[PDB]
Amino acid sequence: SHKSKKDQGELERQLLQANPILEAFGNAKTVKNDNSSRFGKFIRINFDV
Amino acid sequence: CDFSEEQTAEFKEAFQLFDRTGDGKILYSQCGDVMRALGQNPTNAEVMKVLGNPKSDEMNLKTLKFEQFLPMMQTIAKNKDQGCFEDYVEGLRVFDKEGNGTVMGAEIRHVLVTLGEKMTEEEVEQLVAGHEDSNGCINYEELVRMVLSG
Ligand SMILES: [Mg+2]
């Protein structure tokens, strides 16, 4: 939103897709959770000054 | 008197210039407008507070004489409060991401629209000295000095 000349950019478009993909692979219906992770993840989002 | 009537004689002529019947009379909506145009810069609060009443929706009804607006101008002048250039400059540095007073105009626009006395986008469009290129900067200090005049 603050990229007043580069808002709605494509990287911020891809970030929202990275989770559904790794959830389609990876996640599963266990007894306790219908979208069980089955893997741990650690996302790093990198920022400029 | 708190101001020279030899120049309030000019002020009576100045009061005549804007769109009205004249006749020695201005409307309360015009009192604040004239105080902006001729007096020291009032807040809306000062217009409502000094020699008037905050319950003033439809402010074109109430009417005051030039010789009543001049008491209003004098009573404001002796009770107003004023910040120095450094106060407003620091008020900009409070937003400064760059430490150099060059943040993009969209920040100044957002602040002037969003907070306080709620300025319109077209009023800032009259104020702005920059341009909508790929850099977008507005210099703080000299543009503050250009605005803070009279
Ligand atoms: Mg989980």
Swiss-Prot record, chain A:
Tissue-specificity statement: In the kidney, expressed in the glomeruli. Also expressed in leukocytes.
Compartments, record wording: Cytoplasm, Cytoskeleton; Cytoplasm, Cell cortex; Cytoplasmic vesicle, Secretory vesicle, Cortical granule; Cell membrane
Domain of life the protein comes from: Eukaryota
Post-translational modification: ISGylated. Ubiquitination.
Domain notes: The rodlike tail sequence is highly repetitive, showing cycles of a 28-residue repeat pattern composed of 4 heptapeptides, characteristic for alpha-helical coiled coils.
Subunit structure: Myosin is a hexameric protein that consists of 2 heavy chain subunits (MHC), 2 alkali light chain subunits (MLC) and 2 regulatory light chain subunits (MLC-2). Interacts with RASIP1. Interacts with DDR1. Interacts with PDLIM2. Interacts with SVIL. Interacts with HTRA3. Interacts with Myo7a. Interacts with CFAP95. Interacts with LIMCH1; independently of the integration of MYH9 into the myosin complex. Interacts with RAB3A. Interacts with ZBED4. Interacts with S100A4; this interaction increases cell motility.
Annotated family: Belongs to the TRAFAC class myosin-kinesin ATPase superfamily. Myosin family.
Disease connection: Macrothrombocytopenia and granulocyte inclusions with or without nephritis or sensorineural hearing loss: An autosomal dominant disorder characterized by thrombocytopenia, giant platelets and Dohle body-like inclusions in peripheral blood leukocytes with variable ultrastructural appearance. Some affected individuals lack leukocyte inclusion bodies on classic staining of peripheral blood smears. Alport syndrome-like features of nephritis, hearing loss, and eye abnormalities are present in some patients. Deafness, autosomal dominant, 17: A form of deafness characterized by progressive high frequency hearing impairment and cochleosaccular degeneration.
Function: Cellular myosin that appears to play a role in cytokinesis, cell shape, and specialized functions such as secretion and capping. Required for cortical actin clearance prior to oocyte exocytosis. Promotes cell motility in conjunction with S100A4. During cell spreading, plays an important role in cytoskeleton reorganization, focal contact formation (in the margins but not the central part of spreading cells), and lamellipodial retraction; this function is mechanically antagonized by MYH10. (Microbial infection) Acts as a receptor for herpes simplex virus 1/HHV-1 envelope glycoprotein B.
The name this protein goes by in its record: Myosin-9
Organism of origin: Homo sapiens (Human)
Section covered of the full-length record: 197 to 245 of 1960
Swiss-Prot record, chain B:
Domain EF-hand: start-end pairs: 6-41, 83-118, 118-150
Source organism per UniProt: Gallus gallus (Chicken)
Statement: the UniProt record of this protein carries the keyword Acetylation: yes
N-acetylcysteine modification, residue list: 1
Gene Ontology biological process terms in this record: actomyosin structure organization; myofibril assembly
One MF annotation (Gene Ontology) recorded for this entry: myosin heavy chain binding
Keywords: Acetylation, Motor protein, Muscle protein, Myosin, Repeat
Subunit details: Myosin is a hexamer of 2 heavy chains and 4 light chains.
Name of this protein: Myosin light polypeptide 6
CDD domains: EFh
GO cellular component: actomyosin; cytosol; muscle myosin complex; myosin II complex; myosin II filament
Function, as annotated: Regulatory light chain of myosin. Does not bind calcium.
Source domain of life: Eukaryota
